[PDB]
Design a binder for this molecule. Structure first.
Ligand SMILES: [Mg+2]
Ligand SMILES: [Mg+2]
Ligand SMILES: [Mg+2]
Ligand SMILES: [Mg+2]
Ligand SMILES: [Mg+2]
Ligand SMILES: [Mg+2]
Ligand SMILES: [Mg+2]
Ligand SMILES: [Mg+2]
Ligand SMILES: [Mg+2]
Ligand SMILES: [Mg+2]
Ligand SMILES: [Mg+2]
Ligand SMILES: [Mg+2]
Ligand SMILES: [Mg+2]
Ligand SMILES: [Mg+2]
Ligand SMILES: [Mg+2]
Ligand SMILES: [Mg+2]
Ligand SMILES: [Mg+2]
Ligand SMILES: [Mg+2]
Ligand SMILES: [Mg+2]
Ligand SMILES: [Mg+2]
Ligand SMILES: [Mg+2]
Ligand SMILES: [Mg+2]
Ligand SMILES: [Mg+2]
Ligand SMILES: [Mg+2]
Ligand SMILES: [Mg+2]
Ligand SMILES: [Mg+2]
Ligand SMILES: [Mg+2]
Ligand SMILES: [Mg+2]
Ligand SMILES: [Mg+2]
Ligand SMILES: [Mg+2]
Ligand SMILES: [Mg+2]
Ligand SMILES: [Mg+2]
Ligand SMILES: [Mg+2]
Ligand SMILES: [Mg+2]
Ligand SMILES: [Mg+2]
Ligand SMILES: [Mg+2]
Ligand SMILES: [Mg+2]
Ligand SMILES: [Mg+2]
Ligand SMILES: [Mg+2]
Ligand SMILES: [Mg+2]
Ligand SMILES: [Mg+2]
Ligand SMILES: [Mg+2]
Ligand SMILES: [Mg+2]
Ligand SMILES: [Mg+2]
Ligand SMILES: [Mg+2]
Ligand SMILES: [Mg+2]
Ligand SMILES: [Mg+2]
Ligand SMILES: [Mg+2]
Ligand SMILES: [Mg+2]
Ligand SMILES: [Mg+2]
Ligand SMILES: [Mg+2]
Ligand SMILES: [Mg+2]
Ligand SMILES: [Mg+2]
Ligand SMILES: [Mg+2]
Ligand SMILES: [Mg+2]
Ligand SMILES: [Mg+2]
Ligand SMILES: [Mg+2]
Ligand SMILES: [Mg+2]
Ligand SMILES: [Mg+2]
Ligand SMILES: [Mg+2]
Ligand SMILES: [Mg+2]
Ligand SMILES: [Mg+2]
Ligand SMILES: [Mg+2]
Ligand SMILES: [Mg+2]
Ligand SMILES: [Mg+2]
Ligand SMILES: [Mg+2]
Ligand SMILES: [Mg+2]
Ligand SMILES: [Mg+2]
Ligand SMILES: [Mg+2]
Ligand SMILES: [Mg+2]
Ligand SMILES: [Mg+2]
Ligand SMILES: [Mg+2]
Ligand SMILES: [Mg+2]
Ligand SMILES: [Mg+2]
Ligand SMILES: [Mg+2]
Ligand SMILES: [Mg+2]
Ligand SMILES: [Mg+2]
Ligand SMILES: [Mg+2]
Ligand SMILES: [Mg+2]
Ligand SMILES: [Mg+2]
Ligand SMILES: [Mg+2]
Ligand SMILES: [Mg+2]
Ligand SMILES: [Mg+2]
Ligand SMILES: [Mg+2]
Ligand SMILES: [Mg+2]
Ligand SMILES: [Mg+2]
Ligand SMILES: [Mg+2]
Ligand SMILES: [Mg+2]
Ligand SMILES: [Mg+2]
Ligand SMILES: [Mg+2]
Ligand SMILES: [Mg+2]
Ligand SMILES: [Mg+2]
Ligand SMILES: [Mg+2]
Ligand SMILES: [Mg+2]
Ligand SMILES: [Mg+2]
Ligand SMILES: [Mg+2]
Ligand SMILES: [Mg+2]
Ligand SMILES: [Mg+2]
Ligand SMILES: [Mg+2]
Ligand SMILES: [Mg+2]
Ligand SMILES: [Mg+2]
Ligand SMILES: [Mg+2]
Ligand SMILES: [Mg+2]
Ligand SMILES: [Mg+2]
Ligand SMILES: [Mg+2]
Ligand SMILES: [Mg+2]
Ligand SMILES: [Mg+2]
Ligand SMILES: [Mg+2]
Ligand SMILES: [Mg+2]
Ligand SMILES: [Mg+2]
Ligand SMILES: [Mg+2]
Ligand SMILES: [Mg+2]
Ligand SMILES: [Mg+2]
Ligand SMILES: [Mg+2]
Ligand SMILES: [Mg+2]
Ligand SMILES: [Mg+2]
Ligand SMILES: [Mg+2]
Ligand SMILES: [Mg+2]
Ligand SMILES: [Mg+2]
Ligand SMILES: [Mg+2]
Ligand SMILES: [Mg+2]
Ligand SMILES: [Mg+2]
Ligand SMILES: [Mg+2]
Ligand SMILES: [Mg+2]
Ligand SMILES: [Mg+2]
Ligand SMILES: [Mg+2]
Ligand SMILES: [Mg+2]
Ligand SMILES: [Mg+2]
Ligand SMILES: [Mg+2]
Ligand SMILES: [Mg+2]
Ligand SMILES: [Mg+2]
Ligand SMILES: [Mg+2]
Ligand SMILES: [Mg+2]
Ligand SMILES: [Mg+2]
Ligand SMILES: [Mg+2]
Ligand SMILES: [Mg+2]
Ligand SMILES: [Mg+2]
Ligand SMILES: [Mg+2]
Ligand SMILES: [Mg+2]
Ligand SMILES: [Mg+2]
Ligand SMILES: [Mg+2]
Ligand SMILES: [Mg+2]
Ligand SMILES: [Mg+2]
Ligand SMILES: [Mg+2]
Ligand SMILES: [Mg+2]
Ligand SMILES: [Mg+2]
Ligand SMILES: [Mg+2]
Ligand SMILES: [Mg+2]
Ligand SMILES: [Mg+2]
Ligand SMILES: [Mg+2]
Ligand SMILES: [Mg+2]
Ligand SMILES: [Mg+2]
Ligand SMILES: [Mg+2]
Ligand SMILES: [Mg+2]
Ligand SMILES: [Mg+2]
Ligand SMILES: [Mg+2]
Ligand SMILES: [Mg+2]
Ligand SMILES: [Mg+2]
Ligand SMILES: [Mg+2]
Ligand SMILES: [Mg+2]
Ligand SMILES: [Mg+2]
Ligand SMILES: [Mg+2]
Ligand SMILES: [Mg+2]
Ligand SMILES: [Mg+2]
Ligand SMILES: [Mg+2]
Ligand SMILES: [Mg+2]
Ligand SMILES: [Mg+2]
Ligand SMILES: [Mg+2]
Ligand SMILES: [Mg+2]
Ligand SMILES: [Mg+2]
Ligand SMILES: [Mg+2]
Ligand SMILES: [Mg+2]
Ligand SMILES: [Mg+2]
Ligand SMILES: [Mg+2]
Ligand SMILES: [Mg+2]
Ligand SMILES: [Mg+2]
Ligand SMILES: [Mg+2]
Ligand SMILES: [Mg+2]
Ligand SMILES: [Mg+2]
Ligand SMILES: [Mg+2]
Ligand SMILES: [Mg+2]
Ligand SMILES: [Mg+2]
Ligand SMILES: [Mg+2]
Ligand SMILES: [Mg+2]
Ligand SMILES: [Mg+2]
Ligand SMILES: [Mg+2]
Ligand SMILES: [Mg+2]
Ligand SMILES: [Mg+2]
Ligand SMILES: [Mg+2]
Ligand SMILES: [Mg+2]
Ligand SMILES: [Mg+2]
Ligand SMILES: [Mg+2]
Ligand SMILES: [Mg+2]
Ligand SMILES: [Mg+2]
Ligand SMILES: [Mg+2]
Ligand SMILES: [Mg+2]
Ligand SMILES: [Mg+2]
Ligand SMILES: [Mg+2]
Ligand SMILES: [Mg+2]
Ligand SMILES: [Mg+2]
Ligand SMILES: [Mg+2]
Ligand SMILES: [Mg+2]
Ligand SMILES: [Mg+2]
Ligand SMILES: [Mg+2]
Ligand SMILES: [Mg+2]
Ligand SMILES: [Mg+2]
Ligand SMILES: [Mg+2]
Ligand SMILES: [Mg+2]
Ligand SMILES: [Mg+2]
Ligand SMILES: [Mg+2]
Ligand SMILES: [Mg+2]
Ligand SMILES: [Mg+2]
Ligand SMILES: [Mg+2]
Ligand SMILES: [Mg+2]
Ligand SMILES: [Mg+2]
Ligand SMILES: [Mg+2]
Ligand SMILES: [Mg+2]
Ligand SMILES: [Mg+2]
Ligand SMILES: [Mg+2]
Ligand SMILES: [Mg+2]
Ligand SMILES: [Mg+2]
Ligand SMILES: [Mg+2]
Ligand SMILES: [Mg+2]
Ligand SMILES: [Mg+2]
Ligand SMILES: [Mg+2]
Ligand SMILES: [Mg+2]
Ligand SMILES: [Mg+2]
Ligand SMILES: [Mg+2]
Ligand SMILES: [Mg+2]
Ligand SMILES: [Mg+2]
Ligand SMILES: [Mg+2]
Ligand SMILES: [Mg+2]
Ligand SMILES: [Mg+2]
Ligand SMILES: [Mg+2]
Ligand SMILES: [Mg+2]
Ligand SMILES: [Mg+2]
Ligand SMILES: [Mg+2]
Ligand SMILES: [Mg+2]
Ligand SMILES: [Mg+2]
Ligand SMILES: [Mg+2]
Ligand SMILES: [Mg+2]
Ligand SMILES: [Mg+2]
Ligand SMILES: [Mg+2]
Ligand SMILES: [Mg+2]
Ligand SMILES: [Mg+2]
Ligand SMILES: [Mg+2]
Ligand SMILES: [Mg+2]
Ligand SMILES: [Mg+2]
Ligand SMILES: [Mg+2]
Ligand SMILES: [Mg+2]
Ligand SMILES: [Mg+2]
Ligand SMILES: [Mg+2]
Ligand SMILES: [Mg+2]
Ligand SMILES: [Mg+2]
Ligand SMILES: [Mg+2]
Ligand SMILES: [Mg+2]
Ligand SMILES: [Mg+2]
Ligand SMILES: [Mg+2]
Ligand SMILES: [Mg+2]
Ligand SMILES: [Mg+2]
Ligand SMILES: [Mg+2]
Ligand SMILES: [Mg+2]
Ligand SMILES: [Mg+2]
Ligand SMILES: [Mg+2]
Ligand SMILES: [Mg+2]
Ligand SMILES: [Mg+2]
Ligand SMILES: [Mg+2]
Ligand SMILES: [Mg+2]
Ligand SMILES: [Mg+2]
Ligand SMILES: [Mg+2]
Ligand SMILES: [Mg+2]
Ligand SMILES: [Mg+2]
Ligand SMILES: [Mg+2]
Ligand SMILES: [Mg+2]
Ligand SMILES: [Mg+2]
Ligand SMILES: [Mg+2]
Ligand SMILES: [Mg+2]
Ligand SMILES: [Mg+2]
Ligand SMILES: [Mg+2]
Ligand SMILES: [Mg+2]
Ligand SMILES: [Mg+2]
Ligand SMILES: [Mg+2]
Ligand SMILES: [Mg+2]
Ligand SMILES: [Mg+2]
Ligand SMILES: [Mg+2]
Ligand SMILES: [Mg+2]
Ligand SMILES: [Mg+2]
Ligand SMILES: [Mg+2]
Ligand SMILES: [Mg+2]
Ligand SMILES: [Mg+2]
Lengths: 116, 149, 202, 64
RNA sequence: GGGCCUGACUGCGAGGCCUGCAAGCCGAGCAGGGGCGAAAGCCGGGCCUAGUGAACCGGUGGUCCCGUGUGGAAGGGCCAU
RNA sequence: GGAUGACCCCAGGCGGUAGGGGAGCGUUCCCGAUGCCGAUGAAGGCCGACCCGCGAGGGCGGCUGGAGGUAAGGGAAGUGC
RNA sequence: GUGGAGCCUGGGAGUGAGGGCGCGAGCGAUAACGUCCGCGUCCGAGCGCGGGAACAACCGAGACCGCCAGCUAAGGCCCCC
RNA sequence: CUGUUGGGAAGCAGCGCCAGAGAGGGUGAAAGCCCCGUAGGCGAAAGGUGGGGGGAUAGGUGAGGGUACCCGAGUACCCCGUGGUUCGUGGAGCCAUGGGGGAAUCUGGGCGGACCACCGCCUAAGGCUAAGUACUCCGGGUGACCGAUAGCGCACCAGUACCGUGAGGGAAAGGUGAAAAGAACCCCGGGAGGGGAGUGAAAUAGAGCCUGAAACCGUGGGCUUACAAGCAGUCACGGCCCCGAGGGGUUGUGGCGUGCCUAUUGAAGCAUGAGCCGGCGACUCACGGUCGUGGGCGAGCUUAAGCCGUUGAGGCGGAGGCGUAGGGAAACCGAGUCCGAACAGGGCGCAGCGGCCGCAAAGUCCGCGGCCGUGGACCCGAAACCGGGC
RNA sequence: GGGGGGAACCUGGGGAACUGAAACAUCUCAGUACCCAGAGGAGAGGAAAGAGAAAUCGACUCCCUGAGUAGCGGCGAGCGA
């Protein structure tokens, strides 16, 4: 019996096309360019979710550093003091305190100078 | 038990291998053929049972031996098949070429020769020949060797 | 070794039959596979680039035309062209081992016997070729048509009478085979039918 | 169509009871005058072909 | 350097070297019939490593294995070259 | 561990071209089928931010469409761009 | 020394254009992103990740998936960063 | 038959009925019982056939004994040159015959693989001869055959249009609706076209007609954009818009970021291929082999062609094949055998589990899968060669 | 009475090459493709100057098998009673 393509290929192409909604010109319009665009995007996404973890940590650090230097020390000194104090509050949080709770950040800074 | 229940046992019906159907299958593109060259070509190589790249082959360098025959061909001479005493175990009374054919022991168009593997049994065994040890075992067990001609 | 209801003027007696104790569903499957494959017509065909109607002239020169190279237009790469490795007339049959069929025949009957679904009958009352006649008898023998029946008998008059019923498949005893037994829910035999089947599985 | 028996193989080689392949030692067809007696004698025997080579020859003999 | 000699053996060959194959190489030992030596023993060419050529086709000596109804014959096989 | 591939627990492996192997998805067709779904709407199409699945996919919903479709389990290939 | 170790029999391959680097040589001119061998490595197939401005093979390190958590490696900490 | 939904009943519901007929197709949707059919039956004045039956006709039929008349001529036969056969000059016979020579009539002749003998087989040089066999223009039956890029080249007015001096090449092109009820009449317009009206269950079913995808072109809306540097994405945050501790659309800024395929030592590569989209498009099949695997039987396993049966029913058929013993060039011997003087040495060979029971197994058959051989053998592509024609 | 036509099939008279032999000449492809003549619903063959080892068989044709056997073969590729 014969098994002509029939419905199947239209159906794969739409799947891809639908994922490509939003892309520029032929990239959302032509299955071929869609797919090409999509390979790139799966990789960036993968790569970039890896690096979001870095992107944020670098941010927290810049903030913590700014807050430290209001209290006359730098990030490297502050971190070492915390290490020595045994304080394990992570940077996501150090950074939130630095902005939302300055009295608390100050005490931590204190603990950090003292700890050395 | 019904038509919906009829199933071949596991492994009784394996799927075929399909090549040249996409990357996930791991047999796409080159279709497990590797790249380029004669063996990847449609039509492929020479008889790899024989041919060796142009150098004289393994086979054709070994000496021929013996009588290969001449026109008008095979010389007609009587042919003998041996059946051992042990194969005669199953019979009682008499064995003859014909019975042995039926047992699926002696092939048609061969003469019967009785041979010595096994024990003789006091039977009347009729055949075209006996080996030295067959005759011995047979006489000793009180069986009766009968030559045909 | 199995006890099989037999319908009679005496009434529901019994009969002892040695049918296989064990059923080998794979083997039953093999017999059906064979039966259904050998009935195949094998008539799907297609044309090769050689059997297609066009000429063998190379359509345009090999080089310098700025187009792709082609030979004739019968090639499978052309719409209109031949088909690659399409179907050609084919014989689907093969010789399934006789002992397998034999063993299969037996096991199928055995399977029904083991389910109580096998019924032997002495003769058929008033059925003289009329569907209503068979229908009467059938009801009277516990066949309300809620279950499919493979009616096996050498009596032509009984076969005609039953053949139009949607729930009845009919056969001469020489025709008995495992697909038909397995296809139907209930097996009904003449003694004379049952006799040949015994002779067949011997 | 059925496979054909290769006649150069049938004429040079024999398959033994256990399926080894056996052929005559090569090297005393001629130029024998200066060969030692140990040489001529030893080349007078059959040898058993190396497995991969025998395996190939065996396939050319489909009905022995 | 000399004396006697032909083991520059015939039938084999445990076990190895080498090695993709096929080749190549070394070889104790047993048997037959010998050489030299009083004997122990040595001798299956050459101190060694190059001096060579698979298979096909054919020649010659031997064998007496096959011989197209049969006896021969033709022609082949087998051993040697 | 329990007895068996039910699932739980602990540990370890899991970059990959040629290429070996395994397990699946889907397309046409056959048995299942004198059956079953179907105008209270078949297939097909267009949507979907929902459900299941690692995935190939499979559901469900709305709109279109207007007459076909076809399960569990098996079978066979003109089967996937 | 229990390892995606080893050995044996079998089925299926692909490969038989390599390349850079380090070390040892030859060839070349103590030239070549040169050439030809040896040991090793990497790229090939790790054009996946960090460093090296950028950069297959230099340094760091072998990516099963997810995290807006932690510690490090080479390399870095004046601003771009 | 009735009721019901519905444009329409054959759907659903109620109560029936036929069946040697529940194959199938139609009928406004899905019908055994409405139509056409189906099972089962029936039918030819005329032409054709008539392998069966019957009849006729032609034709057919003895035994010793004697005679030695006849028994297929440029023939046999031999030689030369060739072909045919499995036979390629081979030890080359046989059958055939182009050249030369050239008989006999059964006490004749040919043959059994050079030749000779013996022993056999057969009767050359005249002719005919059903059936069993091949094929498919034609008719019919049937499909795990196609379904309008398929299936024939052609579903259609196709071997046509068209191309070519010619031989020759050779397309595309199917579908309103149940029914034409195929839109009277009015309005704008030269018309085409449209807007009303009307038909229809439906008219983006309106004839440029089922469905109506995609590329492609547009109108309208949301968000966005004129100091910005880009494989066009991605991650993050913020703004706006939408659906209603959430999502969706959009994108300003910031981070990161060298298309796809191919071929390569190595490509974003300034190396190949691709304008985009839809459809067509490449590892198959037979027969053998080899391994693996699911089963059947197991010192055995298995049938082929055919025959009988069936008309989606199977069976019979043992001829044959593989296996049961190997070794040897062979004669030949045989659990051995070959080399050899060898009772030497060596090559190649020989030797289940449990309780008579069961279990397993040699082997072999069938299925399935991998790979191999032969075929065009994964698909596409030469330049060329050859035949016959124009 | 012939003549001319007929899709395949059939006999007879002529008769390639690519290709395979991983080059090529014998060999192969193949007595195939093709041209020609002739028949006919078939055609051919057919009633032993046979076979070939059996003291046998008994026209011819066709299928299975014998058998990829016997053999043939640059004893190659292959061919094949
Ligand atoms: Mg397709
Ligand atoms: Mg299609
Ligand atoms: Mg499609
Ligand atoms: Mg696709
Ligand atoms: Mg779609
Ligand atoms: Mg899809
Ligand atoms: Mg966008
Ligand atoms: Mg766009
Ligand atoms: Mg665009
Ligand atoms: Mg578009
Ligand atoms: Mg994707
Ligand atoms: Mg990631
Ligand atoms: Mg990353
Ligand atoms: Mg990290
Ligand atoms: Mg400071
Ligand atoms: Mg620290
Ligand atoms: Mg810390
Ligand atoms: Mg299959
Ligand atoms: Mg794939
Ligand atoms: Mg694989
Ligand atoms: Mg791979
Ligand atoms: Mg590709
Ligand atoms: Mg390839
Ligand atoms: Mg492969
Ligand atoms: Mg391969
Ligand atoms: Mg390739
Ligand atoms: Mg390669
Ligand atoms: Mg390629
Ligand atoms: Mg290459
Ligand atoms: Mg190549
Ligand atoms: Mg290759
Ligand atoms: Mg190619
Ligand atoms: Mg080709
Ligand atoms: Mg080739
Ligand atoms: Mg050479
Ligand atoms: Mg032979
Ligand atoms: Mg007695
Ligand atoms: Mg079929
Ligand atoms: Mg078919
Ligand atoms: Mg066809
Ligand atoms: Mg076709
Ligand atoms: Mg063609
Ligand atoms: Mg053609
Ligand atoms: Mg054609
Ligand atoms: Mg044509
Ligand atoms: Mg044509
Ligand atoms: Mg042509
Ligand atoms: Mg042409
Ligand atoms: Mg041409
Ligand atoms: Mg060109
Ligand atoms: Mg161009
Ligand atoms: Mg072009
Ligand atoms: Mg082109
Ligand atoms: Mg061209
Ligand atoms: Mg072409
Ligand atoms: Mg062409
Ligand atoms: Mg063509
Ligand atoms: Mg076609
Ligand atoms: Mg066409
Ligand atoms: Mg066509
Ligand atoms: Mg095709
Ligand atoms: Mg093809
Ligand atoms: Mg083709
Ligand atoms: Mg095919
Ligand atoms: Mg057929
Ligand atoms: Mg098959
Ligand atoms: Mg068959
Ligand atoms: Mg019925
Ligand atoms: Mg049924
Ligand atoms: Mg030799
Ligand atoms: Mg030689
Ligand atoms: Mg010699
Ligand atoms: Mg010689
Ligand atoms: Mg020497
Ligand atoms: Mg030498
Ligand atoms: Mg010597
Ligand atoms: Mg055989
Ligand atoms: Mg054997
Ligand atoms: Mg002396
Ligand atoms: Mg040795
Ligand atoms: Mg060696
Ligand atoms: Mg001595
Ligand atoms: Mg001695
Ligand atoms: Mg002495
Ligand atoms: Mg010695
Ligand atoms: Mg010297
Ligand atoms: Mg020397
Ligand atoms: Mg040669
Ligand atoms: Mg040669
Ligand atoms: Mg010779
Ligand atoms: Mg003779
Ligand atoms: Mg003799
Ligand atoms: Mg003779
Ligand atoms: Mg004599
Ligand atoms: Mg004699
Ligand atoms: Mg003499
Ligand atoms: Mg002689
Ligand atoms: Mg001789
Ligand atoms: Mg010799
Ligand atoms: Mg000798
Ligand atoms: Mg894990
Ligand atoms: Mg693992
Ligand atoms: Mg890992
Ligand atoms: Mg992996
Ligand atoms: Mg696996
Ligand atoms: Mg698999
Ligand atoms: Mg599924
Ligand atoms: Mg699909
Ligand atoms: Mg599937
Ligand atoms: Mg079908
Ligand atoms: Mg049905
Ligand atoms: Mg149906
Ligand atoms: Mg319903
Ligand atoms: Mg309706
Ligand atoms: Mg609806
Ligand atoms: Mg469909
Ligand atoms: Mg569907
Ligand atoms: Mg979906
Ligand atoms: Mg729908
Ligand atoms: Mg319908
Ligand atoms: Mg179905
Ligand atoms: Mg199904
Ligand atoms: Mg089934
Ligand atoms: Mg295809
Ligand atoms: Mg292990
Ligand atoms: Mg490993
Ligand atoms: Mg490994
Ligand atoms: Mg292996
Ligand atoms: Mg494989
Ligand atoms: Mg290879
Ligand atoms: Mg390679
Ligand atoms: Mg090479
Ligand atoms: Mg290179
Ligand atoms: Mg190198
Ligand atoms: Mg390397
Ligand atoms: Mg190199
Ligand atoms: Mg190096
Ligand atoms: Mg250094
Ligand atoms: Mg160096
Ligand atoms: Mg050097
Ligand atoms: Mg200088
Ligand atoms: Mg560099
Ligand atoms: Mg270099
Ligand atoms: Mg350098
Ligand atoms: Mg250098
Ligand atoms: Mg290296
Ligand atoms: Mg590569
Ligand atoms: Mg690396
Ligand atoms: Mg690596
Ligand atoms: Mg790297
Ligand atoms: Mg990078
Ligand atoms: Mg990468
Ligand atoms: Mg890097
Ligand atoms: Mg970097
Ligand atoms: Mg960087
Ligand atoms: Mg989380
Ligand atoms: Mg740290
Ligand atoms: Mg450091
Ligand atoms: Mg820096
Ligand atoms: Mg800057
Ligand atoms: Mg109404
Ligand atoms: Mg009604
Ligand atoms: Mg009703
Ligand atoms: Mg019927
Ligand atoms: Mg019907
Ligand atoms: Mg109907
Ligand atoms: Mg309607
Ligand atoms: Mg219905
Ligand atoms: Mg229906
Ligand atoms: Mg109906
Ligand atoms: Mg009738
Ligand atoms: Mg009728
Ligand atoms: Mg008389
Ligand atoms: Mg006379
Ligand atoms: Mg005469
Ligand atoms: Mg005359
Ligand atoms: Mg002549
Ligand atoms: Mg000839
Ligand atoms: Mg010869
Ligand atoms: Mg001859
Ligand atoms: Mg003449
Ligand atoms: Mg006479
Ligand atoms: Mg005479
Ligand atoms: Mg004659
Ligand atoms: Mg003669
Ligand atoms: Mg003669
Ligand atoms: Mg004769
Ligand atoms: Mg004769
Ligand atoms: Mg005639
Ligand atoms: Mg007749
Ligand atoms: Mg006839
Ligand atoms: Mg016919
Ligand atoms: Mg027809
Ligand atoms: Mg279809
Ligand atoms: Mg259809
Ligand atoms: Mg069309
Ligand atoms: Mg068409
Ligand atoms: Mg269409
Ligand atoms: Mg037509
Ligand atoms: Mg057309
Ligand atoms: Mg027309
Ligand atoms: Mg012209
Ligand atoms: Mg014209
Ligand atoms: Mg043309
Ligand atoms: Mg066309
Ligand atoms: Mg219509
Ligand atoms: Mg109509
Ligand atoms: Mg008007
Ligand atoms: Mg007007
Ligand atoms: Mg108008
Ligand atoms: Mg208007
Ligand atoms: Mg109007
Ligand atoms: Mg209305
Ligand atoms: Mg409606
Ligand atoms: Mg619409
Ligand atoms: Mg419509
Ligand atoms: Mg249109
Ligand atoms: Mg319609
Ligand atoms: Mg439309
Ligand atoms: Mg439209
Ligand atoms: Mg559109
Ligand atoms: Mg707009
Ligand atoms: Mg500026
Ligand atoms: Mg601006
Ligand atoms: Mg961005
Ligand atoms: Mg941020
Ligand atoms: Mg949002
Ligand atoms: Mg946003
Ligand atoms: Mg976004
Ligand atoms: Mg940042
Ligand atoms: Mg770029
Ligand atoms: Mg790059
Ligand atoms: Mg791609
Ligand atoms: Mg490309
Ligand atoms: Mg290239
Ligand atoms: Mg290149
Ligand atoms: Mg290059
Ligand atoms: Mg670029
Ligand atoms: Mg560039
Ligand atoms: Mg560019
Ligand atoms: Mg270029
Ligand atoms: Mg490019
Ligand atoms: Mg190129
Ligand atoms: Mg173009
Ligand atoms: Mg486009
Ligand atoms: Mg496409
Ligand atoms: Mg394959
Ligand atoms: Mg196989
Ligand atoms: Mg098997
Ligand atoms: Mg069996
Ligand atoms: Mg068993
Ligand atoms: Mg055989
Ligand atoms: Mg021995
Ligand atoms: Mg031994
Ligand atoms: Mg078995
Ligand atoms: Mg293989
Ligand atoms: Mg072919
Ligand atoms: Mg092919
Ligand atoms: Mg193939
Ligand atoms: Mg071509
Ligand atoms: Mg030309
Ligand atoms: Mg030429
Ligand atoms: Mg020429
Ligand atoms: Mg010409
Ligand atoms: Mg001409
Ligand atoms: Mg005429
Ligand atoms: Mg005529
Ligand atoms: Mg002829
Ligand atoms: Mg003539
Ligand atoms: Mg001729
Ligand atoms: Mg002819
Ligand atoms: Mg000519
Ligand atoms: Mg030629
Ligand atoms: Mg060819
Ligand atoms: Mg060939
Ligand atoms: Mg050639
Ligand atoms: Mg060639
Ligand atoms: Mg040339
Ligand atoms: Mg040639
Ligand atoms: Mg050929
Ligand atoms: Mg020929
Ligand atoms: Mg022809
Ligand atoms: Mg004529
Ligand atoms: Mg006839
Ligand atoms: Mg006739
Ligand atoms: Mg005639
Ligand atoms: Mg006569
Ligand atoms: Mg045989
Ligand atoms: Mg040969
Ligand atoms: Mg020939």
């Amino acid at each position: 019996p014969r098994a002509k393509t029939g419905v199947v290929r239209r159906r794969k192409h739409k799947k891809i096309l639908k994922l490509a909604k939003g892309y520029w010109g032929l990239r959302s319009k032509s299955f071929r360019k869609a797919r090409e665009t999509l390979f790139a995007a799966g990789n960036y996404a993968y790569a970039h979710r890896k690096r979001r973890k870095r992107d944020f940590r670098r941010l927290w650090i810049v903030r913590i550093n700014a807050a430290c230097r209001q209290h006359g020390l730098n990030y490297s000194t502050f971190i070492h003091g915390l290490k020595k104090a045994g304080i394990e509050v992570d940077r996501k949080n150090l950074a939130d305190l630095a902005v939302r709770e300055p009295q608390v950040f100050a005490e931590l800074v204190e603990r950090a100078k003292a700890a050395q | 038990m019904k038509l919906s229940d009829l199933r071949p046992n596991p492994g009784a019906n394996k799927r075929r291998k399909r090549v040249g159907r996409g990357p996930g299958s791991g047999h796409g593109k080159t279709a497990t053929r590797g790249h380029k060259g004669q063996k990847s070509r449609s039509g492929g190589l020479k008889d790899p049972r024989r041919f060796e790249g142009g150098r004289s082959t393994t086979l054709m360098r070994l000496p021929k031996r013996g009588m290969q025959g001449q026109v008008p061909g095979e010389i007609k001479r009587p042919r003998y098949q041996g059946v051992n005493l042990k194969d005669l175990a199953r019979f009682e009374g008499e064995v003859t070429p014909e019975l042995l054919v039926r047992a699926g022991l002696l092939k048609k168009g061969y003469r019967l020769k009785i041979l010595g593997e096994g024990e003789a049994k006091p039977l009347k065994v009729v055949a075209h020949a006996f080996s030295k040890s067959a005759l011995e075992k047979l006489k000793a067990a009180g069986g009766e060797p009968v030559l045909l001609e | 070794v199995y006890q099989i209801p037999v319908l009679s003027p005496s009434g529901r007696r019994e009969l002892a039959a040695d049918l296989p104790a064990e059923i080998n569903p794979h083997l039953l499957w093999e017999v059906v596979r064979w039966q259904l494959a050998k009935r195949r017509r094998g008539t799907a065909s297609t044309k090769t680039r050689g059997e297609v109607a066009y000429s063998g002239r190379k359509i345009w020169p090999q080089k310098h035309t700025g187009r792709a190279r082609h030979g004739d237009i019968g090639a499978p790469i052309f719409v209109g062209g031949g088909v690659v490795f399409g179907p050609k007339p084919r014989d689907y049959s093969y010789t399934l081992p006789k002992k397998v069929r034999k063993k299969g025949l037996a096991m199928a009957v055995a399977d029904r016997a083991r389910e109580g679904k096998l019924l032997l009958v002495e003769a058929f009352a008033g059925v003289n070729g009329k569907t209503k006649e068979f229908l009467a008898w059938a009801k009277e023998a516990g066949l309300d048509g809620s279950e499919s029946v493979l009616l096996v008998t050498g009596n032509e008059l009984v076969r005609r009478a039953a053949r139009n019923l949607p729930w009845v498949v009919t056969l001469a005893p020489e025709g008995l085979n495992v697909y038909d037994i397995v296809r139907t829910e209930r097996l009904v035999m003449d003694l004379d039918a049952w006799e040949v089947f015994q002779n067949r599985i011997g | 169509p059925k496979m054909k028996t290769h006649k150069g193989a049938k004429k040079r080689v024999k398959i033994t009871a256990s399926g080894k392949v056996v052929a005559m030692k090569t090297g005393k067809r001629h130029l024998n005058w200066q060969k030692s007696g140990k040489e001529i004698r030893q080349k007078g025997r059959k040898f058993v072909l190396a497995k991969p080579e025998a395996e190939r020859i065996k396939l050319l003999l489909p009905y022995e």
